[model samples]
Every structure is written in structure tokens, then in C-alpha cells.
Target: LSIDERLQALVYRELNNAVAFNKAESGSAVLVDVNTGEVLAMANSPRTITDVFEPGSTVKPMVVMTALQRGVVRENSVLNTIPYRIHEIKDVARYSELTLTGVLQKSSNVGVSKLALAMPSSALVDTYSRFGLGKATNLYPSDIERATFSFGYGLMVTPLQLARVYATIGSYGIYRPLSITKVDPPVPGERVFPESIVRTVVHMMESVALPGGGGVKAAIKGYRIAIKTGTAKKVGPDGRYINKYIAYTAGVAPASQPRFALVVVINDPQAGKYYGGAVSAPVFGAIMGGVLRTMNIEPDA
Candidate 1:
């Protein structure tokens, strides 16, 4: 089932409608069931999975988890988040010390990169493999490249794959094959991690939708949403960073219950503001509110 039947035509209208209205080069939207891994609905304009771009800060959660799993950082462990430049990379804000969850809530590239560097090279590759970053390529790179991948640079993943990452996180660390068809019994899957980590990460993600978090625009009234916003520089065929940007806001709705994971990607927004929170996060709010109301799923707030 290409269309996750739960999705209504109104969603299709709103999804693409938001795309063209934004004056973006193109767009793609996907919603999936957290439990059953059903593809709720996917709207692809100029589709064919071509918009495989870097996921940016949206990939931070995996890094946080990797740090935790390897005993590099505890949930309560705090690290100074003050901005610092490594060779050519730099951030502006000089922040207070942040906890593991705070790193995620704040989407601290500097802090997460610091955490990434804490792990050994083998550990990084192991985490990437476990989280499904990509299987075919040899997980080898320079120190800076590793940091780039940690914060969602260098690694190019499809919109669907991005959706799947959040869906799996929402699904309690299970990787179930998404299907519209009603599979008999159920589609078996691998347990990526324990439910405890998923719960912790979900709660951390909740802050992203709250005031002061980067993804505040993604919030849905009366419902707590676990969200991540990513504004990534799109690379050209010449293997160099281009001026264009891909804005992404991917999150799970009724976050307390974790039923739906929705993703929105805007390609090359020409309307000035291109940050994911500015461009795609509001779409997430619209889609979340629309889905909860249409499906009659009561707000879990």
C-alpha cells in the first residue's frame, strides 16, 4: 500500500500546497505508524527519492544515544556548550553546561561534536551501523568528517530514511518494515535498543517543541510533540557546499503515546527564511493537528 490509508486527501492537498506556497524548488512529506510501521501517507513532488540530503541536527539524537550506549555520556552528564572553532568550524553562542538531553533539546552542534569526538573510531562506525546510517559504504573518514557525519553533515540520507529514523525512535527502537498491506501476524523486526532509551529520548525531543527550543514552531496545541529541526546545506555534483538549503522538521505526534511519525522536507526555500523551524516545522504542526483531528485521536496532553 503506497498510501498509508489513514492519510486523508486533505493531507495531500495541504502537504503539496505548503510546498508550492513556500516557493521551494521541491518537497516531500511522509507519515508512518510508529507501532505497525505502516506508511501512513507520502507526498512526493518531483519524486523518486532524489532529495537525499544531509539530515543536519535532526541526526543528533543518534549521536546522543551512541554516546550513552558506549558509556561516554550519562543521561545527566553535563558538558560545557560554549561555542568554539575547530580549524574552520564555529558556532556563535556561548552556552552554559548542558546535559545529554539538553544537547538534543538545544541541538548543540558544538556539544554533540564534542561528544562524537569522545568515542573511538570503531565505536562511531558501530553506532552508525546500528542506527542504519548506511550499510554499503566503509565507515571510514577523517576526524572532522566524523564530526560532520555526527551532526548530519557528509552523510546523505533520503527523506524516507529520515522519516524511518524518527519512526524507529518513536517505535521504542524497533525497526519494522513499513507496509500498507495488513501483514499476517506481524512483520518481525530487530530490537535496536531498549524501550528505556527511547522513552528518555522522546521526552528530550519534547523540549524541542516547547518555547525556547529550536523547533518551537512545530508544537501542536494540547499535544506534546517530540520534534527535531534540521537546516542543511545542500551539496552540488561538484562535491562542494552550495548556497541552497534543505529545511527539515521531523517529529512524532501525541508524543506521550507515540503513534505517528511525520517528516517534512523543503528544498531550496527562496522566501528568505530557510531554517527548518521557520519553514518546515509549522508544516509539521499543521500536519500533526490535522492528523490527530482527522483520525479522532484525542490529545494526550
Candidate 2:
């Protein structure tokens, strides 16, 4: 679909090389125009369609944003992040004060779940649906479904859908169906939340890539990146989580002015290091760094 030659190569070179270098089972990647919703490049295998996995803390941003939009939480609203444990996850570290920024920066499951609990069940379900969660993937209860759902468990999503979620946030909550063929003006889109609110959330996400952010591995030399990394236990046929994990990192570039969104999902890395930050985020940094140069988009940082 007329992908930037270099961008496509980076996907295979950076993404595939990283997947194999880490000894992952399979992986998928996508690059999209944040404003126009044009899919610049999508690196995926046949398994990407049939296989679905939990997105882990990558979905934390959305839940936090939903709370903000619904007035359940605020940017400056301080939430407890430490000394917390509920359901399946227990004996967590303790933090006394954290705003929305801290939540995403730390990817705190307890903090996010606390926020989710503030909302009613209907609101939570509707929020998930509005974000396109239950539309294409299975979302059922688990042992810690309520708490885990806040940080991205109890649901499954395809790589493409996750890319679309970032597209919406990057475009300030507008959901424009993505297209392979170049689209002019990006077509009008439906807004799920106010542009102002989404922008605020985007900024919080941008912090996730800074030196102190969870996605430090996804940062580029001269650009401000807004990315999230996910490391989740993979489920087996018997519905029990196994030792294996799925690594994910997705983000938008030049946070000041939206340009493109990229997502990388690596399945079952056999390498010693399996965390998303160590496994998939560097791949995100590599592809995006090349894509920015290939498109000749000047660095804004």
C-alpha cells in the first residue's frame, strides 16, 4: 500500500530481528498516521488474527482517561499507589501520593483499579465498549477480573485493534477507521471524548517514555514519545496463566504535535528477559526512529 520503503524495512528489520533475537514465538507491528488514520506499515503474521492476548498495563491510560472524562478522577487527583494488594495480585509496593501522571508513569495496577472502582459497573462496561474493547475480542471474568480489567486483564484484543485505540487518543479521541490506501483529510470521525481531555491524557502518556517513565526503552534521542509497555502472563488452553508472557509496547511520537502511532506485540519470548520494556519497547524505539527520518518529519524535541 505504498508504505515508506524505509518504514517497512524497519518493521521487519527492527521488529523481526528483535523478535528472533529475543527468541519470541511470533510478533506483530503497525505504523499509522495519527491524524489521517492511514496505516503506513503493519508487520504481522497469520497468527495475529486468530490469536488474542491480554494487553496488560497498556490499557491503563484509557481507563484513567475514561475516569477523567466521566469526572471520576482528575489530572491532579492524588491516588494511593503503594502498600496495596487485591485479588490475584498481592503484596505490592507502596506509594502514598500519585496523580494521573504517577499512575501511568508507574503503571500502577492498584492505583488504576481504585479509580475504576469509583465508577459504576454500567459506566465501566460502557467505557470499555466505547473504547472498542468487547467489539472484536473476548472479555470475560477472571479470578481478579475487576481489578485486572482496570490494568488490562479480563479482556483480549488483536494487534490491529490496539493500534486503533492509540489512533483515537492521538487524534484526540476521534476514531477514524484505518485504511491501507492513502486517505485525504482523514475523513471525519466520531468523537468519544472532548479533545481537551484527550490531550491532557496524551501528555500523561508522554511521560511514560521519558527517562523515568515505564517505557524508557521506547524513547528516541530527539523526540518526545508517549508510549506504554505491557507485560502480561499468557493463558493456556485450560484458562490458567502460564509462565510465558506477551510483551507489548505502543506509542505516538512528537507528543507536542501528533504525527504517527506505532504498536509492537511480541508473543512468548523464550529469552531470559521477557518484560515488555526489555523485550518489545526497544523495537518500538527503533522502528519509530527510522520512520520519523524516512518521512522526513523533523524532530520536535
Candidate 3:
């Protein structure tokens, strides 16, 4: 059955009001029907899906998933955070050793870079695109700015695109386009990654919210969740890294069986912690907790 028309209208109206009041000057907001690929609400201004910013640690889960798929790692693979360093790439430096799990839990850029180096560039690019990095989502014709990849150019992607990619990953590697119209049982699409990779990635993501992981604040009282945080340096008008810029959190609840995927990006906060874990993770936890509780989704042990 479809959502009640009146309730849907209320949801859209509230969403519009919220975005109007809260969105960044250059940001966009959207809510889509996961099952039917319907766009329930959207408030897009100057930003388009083609704008790509560094994913930061938000890309870790997918990178880990790719490692798992290639049998280069396991759910419990021990990656040493100390002694972490790799010197293969010319422009990159080595880092202290970290376990695969530790790298993600700590949001260690050096460690993730080493891990990325393990996979061929071609494979990494293909895996990322497969997970919806370098392409248009085809969700709304108006959602333009199809993502592109340059041989030496830095990675670029839109907020909605990244969110949809994470949703697909949380939904077991199925890259379904966002939908805005109601329909019967939605048509399924091709699976993007192996089921094994999905399982391992989900498991590892849960660890991120545990006691010492980057997402410790992401823990909700009664629910099990999987989450990752990202903090990428934004270039300033002067072409230098804006010391403080975008912080992001991407998460899914009931890790064993996700029901919803959420991503939050905060731009240029001045007061508190600037890292995604400190800035975005708590927000994610709070939003998911309230939404889950309101939806009557009981907490998981």
C-alpha cells in the first residue's frame, strides 16, 4: 500500500520547512522512498549530484567491503595502527600500522590510504563507481551533475549521491535508483557487491559504534547500529585547505538487518569538535533513535 496522501503532504511540508531553516547556503536535502525509488521530498539549491568532495572516512566501509570481496581481509583481520606505513606510491607517505578494523574504527586516513593501495587503481575506481561514486543516480532528471573520474583528478561526488550509495550498500549492495512515485512491489536490480562482502562490511561497521570506535556516540539505548564518519578538508576561496569544513556521518540501524540509512553533513562549524565522529555521529544517533522509536522499532540487544 502507498503512504496516506495527507500524511505524505505533512511530511513533505515539514521537510521543506526544516531545510529552509537549516540547510547550508550551498547544500541540498532530499528524502526518497527506498522501496519504490520515489523522491518524497527535496530542497536543492546551488548544489548538484556532480559536485564531489573528499569522502574522508565515509568511504572506509566500502573500501573494507572491497577488501573482503577480494579476500585480502576478513571480518576480524588484525590491522596494526602502529607501525602503519606504506611507501609504494610516490605522492603518498607511509603510516603507523593498524588493523583493518582499527583503521576504520579510528578513521585513520594513513591506514585507509595504505589499504587503498593494496587494490589496483582500476579495481578501486570500479568498486567505487559500482557502489555509486562516479555516476549520476538517475533518481531525478533534475538531479544532474553525473559524477566523473579523472586519472589524476581528486574524487568528486554529491551529497545525495553519496547517501544513496550508502543506502544501496546498507540494502545489501543493490543500486536501486531513488524513487518519488508509488508503485507495487518494486523491481529489484543487479547486486553490486558479493553478499559475503556485505556481511563483512556490515559487521565491521557495527564495530565503529562500539566503545572505542569513531562512532562511539552513535550508540542508541535500544538499537544496534552501524555507522562511519567523514571529515574532509574543503578548499577555501584562496585555493587552500579550509582548516575547518565539512563533517559527515553515514549510518544504518539494526545492523544485522538495517531498516533505514541516514547521512548528515555539517559545513563550517566554528565552536565544537570538527571531526565527523564528534560532529555528525551524535546527530546521527539522535535522529535514528527518535525516528526508530517513533516508528515503533524496538531496540535490539
Candidate 4:
């Protein structure tokens, strides 16, 4: 019950794909049953539960969902993505006129920051708490704090915590307690957000793993995966930013009818590539794909 006997080999196989092939200084991967909230498999080296790092763009989905639930934005709502200096925010590319889905698909910092400004700062903070962020995980700065938080820099979260957060999204807002041992009667979940809103958020995230999206490498041929990538600079013991980085990819598989939620966090890759899309997304796709096929799950793309 502590580990799903059926998936033990399959899970270890793909987690090995990351550690053996990728060769990060430290890394962890967690796979969870979205509906039941059971930790199916985990490969941990630097400690997935206790090691915290900036969430980076991996938190975009929650931010966008909060905006949607608050009615500040709709599925079709469009926002300007032009870089803003006052907020010290910019996108990876010069993109303009992005919809709510586009904001996530492209992982636009400018768009999310602007949306955060459209609502009360407390609203975003409350949603992050509801997503089990700070409740599980930090402190920082003054003026641009809200905007920074919107971009996932002002807060920290462990890989397992992020896995649980994505599992909640995959379950359409059901917040279930994760357990390693067998839970006899099945744990009931609290509805943290409207199902419709979370569903829309998941759909928006689907594009993130598709072509032209940030997590393109995580896409499989016929499966719909809702994923996000993050690259956060590590802060040294001296409390200053360091050259090392944490590359992360978190999402749920078969986005249409989610089953597994996975979070891959690689710390301080010595290789040239450090972006989550580059370093972590491919591993996420590999493990999830293997698990799906090994379990004989049909494609839902």
C-alpha cells in the first residue's frame, strides 16, 4: 500500500530515465493518483518533501485560475503582453494580445503580472494559500512583491507540494490529502474552487505542452497533457541569487480525464541547458508516457 505494486517497476524505470540520463546535481520526481491523492511513485535524491525552491512559472496555472474564478477574466479574455518597465516584467518573446489561455500557453510574465494588477493583491495571495503554497512553504521584498509573487519568484514550494497542487487541478479543484500507505475507505476531498473554473484552467494549460508552448518537449503524440515549466534561480546561503537554477515541470496527464499528476524538479544542472522546458519537461513526458502505456490507458488527445 505504501507503493502501488503494479506501478513500482514502471515508475522506477522512468524516474531512472531522469537521473541516469539527465545527470542533474540533485533531482526529484513524484507521481500521484489525482482522484485518490495517493503517491504512486517517487524518486527522490535531494529530498522532494523538504527541499523548497521558487516555483517560477509553474505557479501560472493557479494565478490564472484565481483570476477566472474571481470573474476578473474569462476564457476568451485578451490581455496585452507588451513589456512593462514600471512592473519590471517582460515576456520571453514580444507577444501582444494574448487570451487567458495564451497567457498560460506561452508562459507570459507580462500577461500574468498585468492580470494580478487587475485584482486585489490579497486575492492572489489567498488563492495561492488555497492551492497549498505558503501553507506548506517564504518571505521577501517590498514594492514589486505582488507582481513578483504573480510570476512565482516571491514564494517557494517543494516538489511534492507542487505535485499535490497539480493533482488538485487535475481533479477539478478537489483538495485531497496525499498518503503513502493504503487508505482503506478512500479520503474525501474538499472542493476548493468551482469545477468549471479548474477545468477551464486545465484546458488552458494543455496548450503549454503543445507546439509553440513553453512545455513543448513534454507533449506526447496522442495524449493531452496539461503542463507548465519553471526555471528559478537558486538563492545562496548568503541570501543572494546564485548562478545555479532549479528547472521544474509539473502537470497532469490525459488532460481530458486526468489520472496522474507529476512534478519533476532538477536542481543545478551542470549541463548548458537549465530551462525547465529544456531540462525537466522531456523527463516528465517520458515517465508519464511510460506509465500510461504500461497501465494500458488509452490516448485522450
**Model 2 lDDT vs. the true structure?**
0.76
RMSD, candidate 4, Å: 2.8
Candidates 2 and 3 compared by TM-score, better number: 2
lDDT of each: 0.75, 0.76, 0.59, 0.80
Which candidate number would show the highest lDDT if scored against the true structure? Answer: 4
- Report the lDDT tens digits of candidate 1 across residue range 107-212: 8888888888888767666665565566331102366877787788877777677777777888878877556554543556779877787787788888888886
User: lDDT tens digits, residues 177-210, model 3?
Assistant: 7655566755586688887677667776787888
Model 4 residue 174 lDDT? Answer: 88
TM-score of each model, paired residue for residue: 0.90, 0.91, 0.76, 0.92
lDDT assessment of candidate 1: 0.75
- Candidate with top TM-score is 4
Worst window of 10 by summed lDDT in candidate 4: 134-143
Encode model 2's per-residue lDDT on 2-107: one tens digit a residue: 2655677678778768777889888888888888777788776423532678877778887888788788876689986654545344313456767789888877
Model 2 segments beyond 4 Å from truth? Answer: 2-5, 45-50, 85-92, 137-144, 275-277
TM-score ranking of the models: 4, 2, 1, 3
Candidate 2 matches the true fold with a TM-score of: 0.91
Who is ahead in lDDT, 2 or 3? 2
**lDDT order of candidates, top first:** 4, 2, 1, 3
Least accurate stretch of 10 residues (summed lDDT) in model 2?
136-145
Clashing pairs in 1: 4-40
- Error (Å) of candidate 3 at residue 82 is 3.9
Query: How good is model 3 by TM-score?
Result: 0.76
